[PDB]
Amino acid sequence: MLSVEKFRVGERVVWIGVIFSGRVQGIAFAFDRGTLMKRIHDLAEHLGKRGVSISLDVQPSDYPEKVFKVLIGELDNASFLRELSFEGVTPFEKKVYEWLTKNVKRGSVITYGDLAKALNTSPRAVGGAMKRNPYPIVVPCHRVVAHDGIGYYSSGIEEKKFLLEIEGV
């Protein structure tokens, strides 16, 4: 199932889409509904290639609002972990996502290199996992930056900057 909702943050508008079936399967966000739908489709295609069964029929749910509460800091990232299904996520990816969520706090950042060192892995493996994160916002991959710049983000540089700004970075 899919739930889509628009939220206002001052003069900006943020659209949040949540794919779910029992527990959360995927999350996407954007500043306009058309972009949101393209990201939802890209995410469904990726999860479907990993064997996850997805239905995009639109249904009401409180998931979008819960995700918005994490975004604005009303709910901490780690408290949302129990809502995630981890369907289509490899054991390695899950390990990275959980460490990041429990240890990289709101208001702070970490470089790809430092995250890799903390998990005994390579910066390229961590980069691959961040690109594939099906749970943006809640699994805070926007807090992972380059040592000399903002770094990449699968959902847009402006989106990454917006999230960092909101968190006080």
Swiss-Prot record:
* CDD domains in alphabetical order: ATase
Task: Please state what class of enzyme this protein is.
Answer: transferase
Highest taxon of the lineage:
Archaea
Where does the UniProt entry say this protein principally localizes? cytoplasm
Q: Which organism is it from?
A: Thermococcus kodakarensis (strain ATCC BAA-918 / JCM 12380 / KOD1)
UniProt key word Methyltransferase: yes
Gene Ontology CC:
cytoplasm
Which first-to-last residue range defines the signal peptide?
none
Listed name of the protein: Methylated-DNA--protein-cysteine methyltransferase
Please name the taxonomic classification of the source: Archaea, Methanobacteriati, Methanobacteriota, Thermococci, Thermococcales
PANTHER family attached to this UniProt entry? METHYLATED-DNA--PROTEIN-CYSTEINE METHYLTRANSFERASE (PTHR46460:SF1)
GO molecular function ontology, one term from the record: methylated-DNA-[protein]-cysteine S-methyltransferase activity
